[PDB]
Design a protein around this nucleic acid. Structure first.
Lengths: 94, 94, 107, 79, 96, 79, 92, 107
DNA sequence: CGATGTATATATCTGACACGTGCCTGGAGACTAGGGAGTAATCCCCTTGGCGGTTAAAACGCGGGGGACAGCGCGTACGTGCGTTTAAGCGGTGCTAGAGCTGTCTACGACCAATTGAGCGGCCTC
DNA sequence: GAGGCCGCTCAATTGGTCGTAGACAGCTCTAGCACCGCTTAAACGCACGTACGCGCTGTCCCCCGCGTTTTAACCGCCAAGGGGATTACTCCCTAGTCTCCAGGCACGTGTCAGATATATACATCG
C-alpha cells in the first residue's frame, strides 16, 4: 500500500507534465447547451466553439486553485476549504 | 480659447430632479469627467462592433448592442427603452 | 425657415448636435448615422439623472442644500449597479463608506 | 441537470494540476457553482455577438471576443 | 482616568471614516515627489495641482491595500496586520 | 532620504481609514517601500508624457493620463 | 484570400534556427501575437497625437508608445532597432 | 522607369513595410501617417518575433525534439521575466503550466 | 454614578455661487452626388441524428491513520498618556522662467494613374 | 503531418501635383520659485500595563488507497438538410457646401449658505 498522499505527488507531476483536457467532452457540451437555452432556443454551436469554452474554463479553474492553495497555506492548513475560495475571489474582486 | 463643457445641461437635469438644490463646482467637474468617460466607452465598443461585421456606418443597432454589452442588469433595460423612445419621437416628429 | 433645435425635437436636454459632431471627429468610423446621437444622448441623460437624483437625496439626508463630492461617493457606492459600472474609479475628496468588521467590535 | 456531468474525479484532476494535495469534500459543490457563473457570463456575451450578426450559429470568434471583453485573451483559435 | 486598549482605536476608525481630509503632510510629500523625479529628468518644475493629484492617488491606493490586508489578517484568526498579510494581498492582487 | 517624511502617524491614520484596529511595528518600513514603487511607476509615465510634449513643466493632465494607462482613473482634475 | 504573416514568421525562424520547423498551431499562435501587439502600439500612438493637438502620427509617437508599453530592456533594444532601421532607410 | 525594389529590402527587414503602412492608414488611427512610422513598427515587430522564436527553439531542442509546439511557446513566455510581463494576461491553448510545487508541500 | 466626548443650538460674517450683459462661432436649413447597404437566389459545407460495440472510466464499500481544531499557558509587544521641541503652515514681497499666442511660409503627405511580380490556393510526396 | 512546386492576379511601386499644418521667431503676462517672520499644531520621546500571538498536547473523524462492478464515453460509419457564404441589382441614405442667425462662452456684480466661535445638553464608557 502506498502511504496517504504519496500518489498525489505523482498525480501532480503527471498533470503538470501533460497538456490534455481533463473534463469529459460530452458532459461539458450538454452543460453548455443547457445554459444557452436560457438566452435563445434553437441555437447551433460550432464544434470548435465548445473546445474554446472548455480551454478557457479549465485555465480559469486551475488559476483559481493556485490562489486557493496560497490562501490555505496562509492559514497553516494543508487542506483547501470553501472559505479559501471565497477569500481569493474576494481579493481578486469577483 | 473657449472651453466647451456639459455644465449647462447637467444643471438643467438637476433642476428637474431636485428644484431646491444646487451643485458645487467640484462636483460639476466630477460629473463633467463622468460623461466624457462613458461617452468614450460606448463609442469605442460601437466602433469594434462595426469592424467585426465589416460594416462602415455606425447605427442605432451598434449603440444598442454596445449599451447591452456595457451596462449591468436593469440599467441596460431602462437605457434601451429611453433610447428607443427618443428615436421614435425624433422620427415621428419629422 | 425658423430654426428649431434637434434636441427639442427629440425631447432631450443634452446636445444632439454636439454629440454628432464629436462622433464624426472622434475617428470611430468613416460614417455616422442620423439616429446614433439621439440614442447616445438619451442614454447619457438617463445615467446623469440617476446619479444626480441619488446624490441629491444623500444631500437631503445630511440636511445640506448643495451637492459636494462626498454626496456623489455616497450615491455611487451604495448602489450595487452603479458601483459595478464605476468600480475602477477614484473620486477626489470622496472618502470611504463607514464599515467595521464584526470581529473587531467589543464582545 | 447536466452540472452533475462535472464529476468529482474531474475536479480532482484540476486541483492536482493546480498543485493541491488534499481537498475537503465540500469543495465540489462550491466549484460547480463558481464554474456555472463563469460560463453564464461568457455565454451571455457570445450570444449577444451572435444576435447582433443575425446568425443562428455561435462561432468560435464570438467566444474569443466575449473572453477579450472580460480582459482574458485566448490564443489559438484565430484573431 | 484611563481608557482600555482599543477603544480610542475604534473612535479613530469612526472619525477617519467619517471625514474626507487628506492625511499625509503636504510639504514632506512634495519633497519626496521632487526627489523621485530628478532620477528621470533634471530641472523639472511641478504645477501645484499635479502634486495634489499624486497625493490623492497614493492615499486612495494605500487605504484599499490596508482593507485587503485586514481581510487576510482576520482569515488567519488574528486582529493584528502583519507584513505577510500585505505580501499575500499583493500576490493575489497580482502586483507581486 | 525624504521617504522618512511619510511619518508613522500618517501611516497609522491611513490604516485607521481602512478599518485596521491593531498594527504590528514592522508595517511602516514595508509600507514606505510599497509607496515608493507606486510613485516611481506613476512618475516615470508622467515624465514620459511631459518629454513627448517638449515641456519642462509637469502638469495635472500628465498625471491623470499616467493613471489612466495604468487602470486607476481619477475624477475631478480633468477629462 | 486571407492575408497572414506566416511566411515572414517562417523566414525569421530560418534566421534563428535553420534546422527547426514549426507546426500550424504554433504558427496561428504567432499570428495572433503579432496582431495583438500591432493594435496595442497603434492605439497609444493614436492617443499621444490627440493630447498634443497633432493631426499626424510620426516616428516619435511610435517611439514613445514603445517606451510606454514594453518593459525596460525590451524597450531599450526595440528603440535601438527602430532607429537603425529608419536611418538605414532614409540615408539609402 | 526605375526597377522596383521593396521598401522592406531597403530597410533590411523581413516584415512587410507596405502592408503595415496600409494597416495604419486603413485603421482610423489618425488622418495622416508619416513615412517613418511603418519602418519603425515593422522593425519592432520583427525584433519581438525573433526574441520569442529563439527561446522557443531552445525549449524544443532541450526536449530533444525538432518541431516547435504550443507547449514550447508557453515554456518560453513563462520562463522569461520580461515576456511574462508583456504577456501576463494571456492564455495559450494546449500550453499547460510550469512545473512548480510549494516547498512546504514536499516531504 | 461620575465625567468625558460628541451633538446641537445661537450669532457672526465673507466669498462662492447665481444672475445679467455682450458677442461671435458654431449649429441649422436647403441642395446635390454616389456608393454602401438591403433584397433575392443558389450552392454545397458541416451540423445534428442514429446504430453497434468494447473497453476506459466512474461509482460503491471497506479500512485506517493523517490532519483539523479545541483548550491551555505565558511573556513581550503595542496602545494610552504626559511633556518637550521642531518645522509645518500662513501672509507677504519680489521676480523672472516659460507657458501660451501670433504671424510667416515651405516641406510634407494625400491623391491618380499605369505597370508587374509577391504571395495565395491547391496538388503531390517522404 | 509539413514542405516543394505550379498558375496566376491584385496589391504594391514610381512618378507628378497641390493644399496646409507644423516649424520658426517675436511677444507678453502668468505662476512657479526663493526668502522672511511668527504662531502653535503636530511630532517625538519615555513610561507602563494588559491583551494578543505563539507554541503545545490530545482526539476523533473523514480523506486517501484498493478491489469489483457497471455504465455511458468514445470510435466509426451512414443520412440528410439547415444554414453560411457568395453573387447580382439598385435605391436611399450620409457626405460636402454655402448662408445666416441665436446659443453658449467670458466678464462683472453682489448677497446668503456655509465656516466659524461659544454654549451646553445628553450619551456613553468604566
Amino acid at each position: 500500500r502506498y502511504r496517504p498522499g504519496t500518489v498525489a505527488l505523482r498525480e501532480i507531476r503527471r498533470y503538470q507534465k501533460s497538456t490534455e483536457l481533463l473534463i469529459r467532452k460530452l458532459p461539458f457540451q450538454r452543460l453548455v447547451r443547457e445554459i444557452a437555452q436560457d438566452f435563445k432556443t434553437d441555437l447551433r454551436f460550432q464544434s470548435s466553439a465548445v473546445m474554446a469554452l472548455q480551454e478557457a474554463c479549465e485555465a480559469y479553474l486551475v488559476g483559481l486553485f493556485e490562489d486557493t492553495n496560497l490562501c490555505a497555506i496562509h492559514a497553516k492548513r494543508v487542506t483547501i476549504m470553501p472559505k479559501d475560495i471565497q477569500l481569493a475571489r474576494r481579493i481578486r474582486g469577483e | 480659447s473657449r472651453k466647451e463643457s456639459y455644465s449647462i445641461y447637467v444643471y438643467k437635469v438637476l433642476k428637474q430632479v431636485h428644484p431646491d438644490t444646487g451643485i458645487s463646482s467640484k462636483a460639476m467637474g466630477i460629473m463633467n469627467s463622468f460623461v466624457n468617460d462613458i461617452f468614450e466607452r460606448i463609442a469605442g465598443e460601437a466602433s469594434r462592433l462595426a469592424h467585426y461585421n465589416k460594416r462602415s456606418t455606425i447605427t442605432s443597432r451598434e449603440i444598442q448592442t454596445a449599451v447591452r454589452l456595457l451596462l449591468p442588469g436593469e440599467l441596460a433595460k431602462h437605457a434601451v427603452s429611453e433610447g428607443t423612445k427618443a428615436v421614435t419621437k425624433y422620427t415621428s416628429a419629422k | 425657415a425658423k430654426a428649431k433645435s434637434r434636441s427639442s425635437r427629440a425631447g432631450l436636454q443634452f446636445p444632439v448636435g454636439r454629440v454628432h459632431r464629436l462622433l464624426r471627429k472622434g475617428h470611430y468610423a468613416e460614417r455616422v448615422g442620423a439616429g446614433a446621437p439621439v440614442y447616445l444622448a438619451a442614454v447619457l441623460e438617463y445615467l446623469t439623472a440617476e446619479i444626480l437624483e441619488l446624490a441629491g437625496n444623500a444631500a437631503r439626508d445630511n440636511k445640506k442644500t448643495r451637492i459636494i463630492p462626498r454626496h456623489l461617493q455616497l450615491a455611487i457606492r451604495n448602489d450595487e449597479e452603479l458601483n459595478k459600472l464605476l468600480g475602477g474609479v477614484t473620486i477626489a475628496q470622496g472618502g470611504v463608506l463607514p464599515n467595521i468588521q464584526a470581529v473587531l467590535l467589543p464582545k | 441537470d447536466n452540472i452533475q456531468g462535472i464529476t468529482k474525479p474531474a475536479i480532482r484532476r484540476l486541483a492536482r494540476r493546480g498543485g493541491v494535495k488534499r481537498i475537503s469534500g465540500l469543495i465540489y459543490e462550491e466549484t460547480r457553482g463558481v464554474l456555472k457563473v463563469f460560463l453564464e457570463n461568457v455565454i451571455r456575451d457570445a450570444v449577444t455577438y451572435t444576435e447582433h450578426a443575425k446568425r443562428k450559429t455561435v462561432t468560435a470568434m464570438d467566444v474569443v471576443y466575449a473572453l477579450k471583453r472580460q480582459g482574458r485573451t485566448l490564443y489559438g483559435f484565430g484573431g
